[PDB]
Amino acid sequence: SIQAEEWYFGKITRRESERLLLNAENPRGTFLVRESETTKGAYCLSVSDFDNAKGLNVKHYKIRKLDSGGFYITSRTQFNSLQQLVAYYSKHADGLCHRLTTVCPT
């Protein structure tokens, strides 16, 4: 069940994800997964970052789920579930701003 996952915030907007993730206590890679505002059926992975150019900021990545079944940010790297996707990006930064670290406090 993706609901019940503690990093799943469901139906919260992009601005709300930023409100939550822009807290100075959050390290790089603090993150949550929410519904997409623009794509039905898709999700957004919202991730905090920090650099001396930008300070604290947030990136959003769309996660699609095919009817054939896989979950992905890039179709070149698919997962059998949202959990395994989250599990993989918590170990590999790849094209993300930072590898996933901590679940966003509420």
From Swiss-Prot:
Post-translational note: The phosphorylated form is termed pp60c-src. S-nitrosylation is important for activation of its kinase activity.
Stretches assigned to the SH2 domain: 7-104
Subcellular localization: Cell membrane; Mitochondrion inner membrane; Nucleus; Cytoplasm, Cytoskeleton
Residue numbers bearing the Phosphotyrosine modification: 43
Tissue: Expressed ubiquitously. Expressed in the skin (at protein level). Platelets, neurons and osteoclasts express 5-fold to 200-fold higher levels than most other tissues.
Family under the similarity heading: Belongs to the protein kinase superfamily. Tyr protein kinase family. SRC subfamily.
Other remarks in the entry: May be involved in blister formation in Pemphigus vulgaris, phosphorylated-SRC is abundant at blister sites but not in normally adherent tissue, which corresponds with loss and disruption of CDH1 in cells adjacent to blisters. Phosphorylated SRC is increasingly abundant at pre-lesional sites of blister formation and occurs prior to changes in abundance of CDH1 and DSG3.
Subunit annotation: Part of a complex comprised of PTPRA, BCAR1, BCAR3 (via SH2 domain) and SRC; the formation of the complex is dependent on integrin mediated-tyrosine phosphorylation of PTPRA. Interacts with DDEF1/ASAP1; via the SH3 domain. Interacts with CCPG1. Identified in a complex containing FGFR4, NCAM1, CDH2, PLCG1, FRS2, SRC, SHC1, GAP43 and CTTN. Interacts with ERBB2, STAT1 and PNN. Interacts with DDR1, DDR2 and DAB2. Interacts with CDCP1, TGFB1I1 and TOM1L2. Interacts with the cytoplasmic domain of MUC1, phosphorylates it and increases binding of MUC1 with beta-catenin. (Microbial infection) Interacts with HEV ORF3 protein; via the SH3 domain.
Domain notes: The SH2 and SH3 domains are important for the intramolecular and intermolecular interactions that regulate catalytic activity, localization, and substrate recruitment.
Disease note: SRC kinase activity has been shown to be increased in several tumor tissues and tumor cell lines such as colon carcinoma cells. Thrombocytopenia 6: A form of thrombocytopenia, a hematologic disorder defined by a decrease in the number of platelets in circulating blood, resulting in the potential for increased bleeding and decreased ability for clotting. THC6 is an autosomal dominant form. Affected individuals may also have bone abnormalities and an increased risk for myelofibrosis.
Descriptive protein name: Proto-oncogene tyrosine-protein kinase Src
Origin species: Homo sapiens (Human)
